[PDB]
């Protein structure tokens, strides 16, 4: 569609791969996925130099989203440490990413792009959840919430594999925001320290997040999504307040 | 065009509007921009009920990108405080978002969508730098680095305004990853605390990022982008190490 956009896409794609290669470390599964996506990047470059440029761009745009996914998965695998629940989720997201790449190579591009839209959001959510658990430290209330978000992401991935992609997409949207909220609450509690004023505001916002999850599980989706958007804003503000004290 | 996709985009777009309203506070310029995007959202919902559902989704997909940009701008202005450099970039990005919305309303949808590609990424960048400045505290090296990122972002906005959209997008891409790098390094410096061994690693990684920016300013973009990509991974790894102590 444009030579200028191709070079721009190729530059960021190599950047995601370079970071993914480093974050993958010694894990053979992460290294295999990065090399697989890297070979798809170089295949799109040969097609741009030789054959169809508009087709090479569509392959590059797919490669870009796969590179960002594998980089978040690799970052999630590092922060996950030895937690089996997080490690298990990294494996499920990796397998679905590999299947989507095969589906794109096979020619079913619409299905593969539909799959990666779900895979990319799940990869970012598990990275944010993994960082939240690390930031939570030894706080039991924070670890319980992070574990509660993890199982919700597990149900969304399983619902997607069952066939109901629409319901799984709605659940993954809720999981993605609840993950971003708990990561800021955990960062707030870390930055608060021994300050009793900020540590009290963290518990209150943490209670509002649990209520938003309970609203989603009950059935009121419209009210649950509104409650979560409010919790995320408050979590960012309390994290800003705590960081200003340091 | 799909009904389930439209309902999905509308739910997410309302989430961004809701969060942007709280982050904007009493800012009259921010709340006005949120209200304009919110009215475009409701306009897309009315078209979905009474007219072309395919055109309503195309409008809603533009609204979603605009709503995510105004949320990051509100978060940036909230975290920026009275910082004049960050304030200056906030209204410049806010101004560009306004023109792109009026462009979409005039019928030129392709030019408006190309504008939001620059505006959204710039809005996320200025929000990350603003969070990096707060995490920096009084650290002069982290403050100087944050200012260096903001200068590159200023050049990218001005180059985009002067016509060369290609060069501006390349610099804005560098600005975005460098912004994410300084935020993780500043978070690592905060999480390290009084650990001299960890602060040396944070200090050295900050220097590797400074060298990456100098390679970009020298003209060698290819090597500068690889260096920035390597620094970003190292910044994420040192913040994890600092958090585990």
Author numbering:
A (entry chain A): -1 to 244
B (entry chain B): -1 to 243
Q: What's the publication's text?
A:
To investigate the photophysics of special pairs independently of the complexities of native photosynthetic proteins, and as a first step toward creating synthetic photosystems for new energy conversion technologies, we designed C2-symmetric proteins that hold two chlorophyll molecules in closely juxtaposed arrangements. For Chl dimer protein scaffolds, we chose hyperstable C2-symmetric repeat protein dimers containing symmetric pockets with tunable sizes and geometries. In this dimeric repeat protein architecture, the hydrophobic core is independent of the small molecule-binding site, enabling full customization for binding with little impact on the overall protein structure. We describe de novo-designed proteins that hold Chl dimers in precisely defined, closely juxtaposed geometries.
SP2 was intended to assemble a ZnPPaM dimer with a conformation substantially different from that of native special pairs to investigate the effect of dimer geometry. The SP2 crystal structure was solved in both the apo state and the ZnPPaM-bound state to 2.4 and 2.5 Å resolution, respectively. The apo- and holo-state amino acid backbones both agree with the SP2 design model to within 1.4 Å r.m.s.d. Compared with the apo-state crystal structure, the SP2 binding cavity widens by ~1.6 Å in the presence of ZnPPaM; this expansion provides the extra volume needed for the ZnPPaM molecules to adopt their unexpected conformation.
